[PDB]
Amino acid sequence: IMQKSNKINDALNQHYKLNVELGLVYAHYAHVADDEFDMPYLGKFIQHLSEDKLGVHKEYISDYFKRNGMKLKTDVSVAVKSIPSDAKALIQEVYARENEVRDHVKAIAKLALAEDDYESFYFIQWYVRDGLKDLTEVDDVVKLFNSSNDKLIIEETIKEMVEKEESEHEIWG
Template identity: 30%
Template sequence: MRQDRAMIGSKMNEALNAQIGREFGASYQYYALAAWFEEQGLPGFAKFFLRQGQEENEHALKIVHYLGEVGGHVVLPAQPQPKSTYESALAAIESFLAAEQEVTRAIYELVDLATAEKDHSAFEFLQWYVSEQREEVASATGLLDRARRFGEERVVLLDSTLS
């Protein structure tokens, strides 16, 4: 971190670096989901998760850019290999919802930290993520609800609506 222009504390900087890792991790997981759905012959789901992976990538890069703006220091955490097989399409979609819920929890913790640290810039920056995560969890919940209504044996019909 460049001390001569740093507008961010070390705790917030470290926490945002961890969030970069979570966002890239979610991206990696969604790319793995896209590959799994492609292998299952469900191209609509594959495209959906490819787009989700790209979105998570953008979320991570947005934090990288923010840290640059405030004189922070970016450290890109290593990523573990994501899960690559699932028992069913429903199980795969459940993992999507769980990942979005985890990212949401982490965003809320970042907002709490920004408040505690009196980092008004980070607090304002994170409001976009609060709104985005509300949409992401709603989207994941809706997809899972629809998949459950269709059932595993008819998930191919839902797949055709996602292309």
């Protein structure tokens, strides 16, 4: 009884993989934001997202697997072979990737209900909430590139974003 769902196990190993590979791309994008685009605070913002993906995002999946008999797979391949041409396109690409996360997570929630896997549906709620929270944070930075042509003005707003004391939203936090 209570035998783990192989399909959920697969989708969650795929999501583990995505979060590792995303985190490694974001670490590269963070380097480039500072080094090539002269935007160290944009770099810090993207580096923090890197550490979220390679941190709690993958960690919680590994922890979940230990509780329920699911098997962890580590199979990672990613190469950063071209970069967006400027900072605005850099954060727009981060935006595009986070939007894809929301769609991947939606599939996992739908699958958990289909499997009558209510522990997995419960578990994935964190990723449902964080999918939109993460997109909103990236959106707040995308907006800046449309509200000013001055990189240092943009950088000052990003600086207060990354140095603000995090206070969770009651629902999305």
